[PDB]
Amino acid sequence: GAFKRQVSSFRETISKQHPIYKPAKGRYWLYVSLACPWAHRTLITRALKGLTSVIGCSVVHWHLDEKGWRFLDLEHWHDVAGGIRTAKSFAEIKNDSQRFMVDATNEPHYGYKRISDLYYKSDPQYSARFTVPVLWDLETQTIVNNESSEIIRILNSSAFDEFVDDDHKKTDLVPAQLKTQIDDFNSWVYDSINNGVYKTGFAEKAEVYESEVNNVFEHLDKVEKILSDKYSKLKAKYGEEDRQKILGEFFTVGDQLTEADIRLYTTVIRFDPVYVQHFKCNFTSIRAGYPFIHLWVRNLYWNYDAFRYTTDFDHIKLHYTRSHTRINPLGITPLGPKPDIRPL
Amino acid sequence: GAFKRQVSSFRETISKQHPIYKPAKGRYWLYVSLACPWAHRTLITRALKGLTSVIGCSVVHWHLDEKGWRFLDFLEHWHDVAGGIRSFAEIKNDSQRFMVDATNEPHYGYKRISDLYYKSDPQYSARFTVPVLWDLETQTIVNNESSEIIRILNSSAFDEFVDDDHKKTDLVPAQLKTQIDDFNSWVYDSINNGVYKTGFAEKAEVYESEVNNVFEHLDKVEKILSDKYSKLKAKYGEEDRQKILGEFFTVGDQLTEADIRLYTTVIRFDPVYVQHFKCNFTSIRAGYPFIHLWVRNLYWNYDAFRYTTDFDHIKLHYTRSHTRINPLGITPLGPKPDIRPLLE
Known part of the structure; x- marks a missing residue:
């Protein structure tokens, strides 16, 4: 009756020597959910390494149905959270809520409605789970890497050093x-x-x-x-x-x-x-x-x-x-604890 | 989608002047669940007023299925404050640990609290709730409203059968x-x-x-x-x-x-x-x-x-x-402890 996390399938890197994926501005993208702790690692690392203008970001909806993460149908792309802002209760918010730049972004490059569209473009025979985060190459239209522990190493590496400023290049999250x-x-x-x-x-x-x-x-x-x-x-x-x-x-x-x-x-x-x-x-x-x-x-x-x-x-x-219908069958979000994080 | 608690149907009292339900030792019985906060009121009051040897007690199983509260198939037990009741993963919903999960119904061998309800009133057609204050002489439910049962226990009704220290205790001065x-x-x-x-x-x-x-x-x-x-x-x-x-x-x-x-x-x-x-x-x-x-x-x-x-x-x-809340029936182990010590 145990949960077994699947191993991530896309395990490539980006480097000046790589035959396919070389560092550049305007080439790579990060598709995330704000709810996912694995994808959150990548957003934090993207910000700390000064890569928000180098690697764009888009954000799937927080509602995860049976067809996988979905999207809604420049200042945002290069923002630390893809442009998502928290709205100024949860009961009025339905699972099909459509608050653009609040619940989700669109998929800006192809107009895809589903993260699975990116997986199938990269590998038409893909048969595993359509997980976030996804590090995407716009040139080849493939997934570079979808393992958060590796994405954060790529981001912290020297790969993008030419395209960042002097203060961020020097930051090293894995000395x-x-x-x-x-x-x-x-x-x-x-x-x-x-x-x-x-x-x-x-x-x-x-x-x-x-x-x-x-x-x-x-x-x-x-x-x-x-x-x-x-x-x-x-x-x-x-x-x-x-x-x-x-x-x-x-x-x-x-x-x-x-x-x-x-x-x-x-x-x-x-x-x-x-x-x-x-x-x-x-x-x-x-x-x-x-x-x-x-x-x-x-x-x-x-x-x-x-x-x-x-x-x-x-x-x-x-x-x-x-x-998670097998945990919370009616989908009623608890209001507590209050607050979400206490002040310092 | 709101919960509307039913009004309790049995609302009689016990008194010396009553034509039917007069006080005595050995005549009335208190059927409870230890899980229920309503029934719990009556157990606390029974103890505080010194009535454990005057009014016996029996305890239904903690598991509440579609057919209602149930019993499992002794002097000290009936007159104990909790009817004699003495990790969760090993305990199944059909657990049958006598004097641990439940007691029996000792007067008639009924397996269901509904049996007491139909005995009292064959036309009963609401929920078969605990607590039940039962008359062994007429085989009826005297009162199934916890707020009134605790007034009965606190009243002068049973004063002839308790010691003077308990007689003087008054929970509603x-x-x-x-x-x-x-x-x-x-x-x-x-x-x-x-x-x-x-x-x-x-x-x-x-x-x-x-x-x-x-x-x-x-x-x-x-x-x-x-x-x-x-x-x-x-x-x-x-x-x-x-x-x-x-x-x-x-x-x-x-x-x-x-x-x-x-x-x-x-x-x-x-x-x-x-x-x-x-x-x-x-x-x-x-x-x-x-x-x-x-x-x-x-x-x-x-x-x-x-x-x-x-x-x-x-x-x-x-x-x-409560399957519509916890569909898999997995009991959380926390918080630890159930109640903290009173540390000064």
Whole structure:
């Protein structure tokens, strides 16, 4: 009765040496959902690496029906969130809602209504799931890569350095000095937290649900310990009153913002708004039960534009509650918790 | 898509002057579910008024199927505060653990509470609800309205059969009667039944109206208790926690029926109503400090409350019986713990 995530099929890279996919401005596109934590990784990374004008973005609807992610039928393409803005209750919003630049964008290059149209163009024999994110090549009309862990490495690589400014080129979310630390952390966070919440919420037998939920909270406890130890050291170094200096080095790995933080964030920012109620990951919440994770996630959300302005809590809450009929059969979106993220 | 609770049909009383239903030991029986907050009112009141050996009790299974509450196929059990009732994945909906999932119906061997209803009135055609206050002599339902059963138990009706300490206990003192009734009225509509109008709503517009109403009224209760705590802190000093708590109640300065009626909802709120009925702006433990102190004082410090509160029956009943809310019948393991200790 367990959930098994399928392996992603499109696994190519972009580099000056690549025979097909070489770096250029105006060539590649990023198709995402704002509700998906995997695709969220790519949006955050695109922003932190200064690539919003280099790689355009479009956004599928938050409602996921049986035919897969769908679209509605320049300032937006090159925006951190593809131009989506949260509207100024959920009950009046139906699953077929058509608020252009609120629920979704269009697909601007071909007018496709379905993300499956891109998959079939790339591989007419494709037979797997039509997932987001998709890194798309406009020249060959193919999917370069649809594995979020690899897309973020492509984005952080030197590939696009000619087309970005001096400050962003220098940002390195996977420094060699921390690479074993990042890769370790990522491995167990993936299995027990990023994917752990899905193995918990999609379980169809309680035995699997219980095993997986225990494993989620056991690993949140590990993260919380790492952060608690780091906070102790920073408080000794700077004094607890100098909160600003403390937060400037308050990260999961090392003393700087890395990929490990990005990958954790996309799960943690969804945890209280969705995963507690909807995936039954409910021993406690981040805000009530995990002070150091809670501080860490609020620092990233409130103080980093790449996190705040790619985080759409309406897409998050509506996607899960409205799409997963075997969890929420009537599609009624809970109004709580309030607020979606507490202030810092 | 709104939930309209039926009016209870059996509304008679027991008294010395009554032509039919006079008080006696060994004559009346109380049939309950430990999951039901309405029936829970009657168990608490039965204990507080010292009536456990006067009025026997039997307990239906926590699983509620389409044919209604059911029994499984002893002196100490019948006269116990909870009828003798002593991970969830291993417990199936057809679980048959005698004295754990349910008791038997010991007078007639009925397998269904509907059997008692049809015995009393062969033309009955509403829902077969708990609690039931049953007369063994006429084989009828005296009263199936929890708000009236607790008045019967509190009345002078059974005073000849209890000790003097219990006889003097009065859960509806005259000086507080009107305030008890007025508090009870809005707590009923907005909290006791408010959580059910919220969780059983099948249209989002009704869900949202009712959930906002629940939290608006919990705010009202919290204000009452905060003001009362402030007065007690002045009367006694914050250090005298035992003297403060000895007067820390919803109406006046003593335990009343108003506390009992609020408690059966509040004790279920974090274990069930937050996740399952989507009453989730916040939780009691995180969001309502004065309600949280009040309910922990009742649970831990009054045996009539603690030893009638069965969190397995509570969690299993709701999550395993409400298929249109929880289609796969998977009981969340959290929140942990069911009720927090009263840490000073």
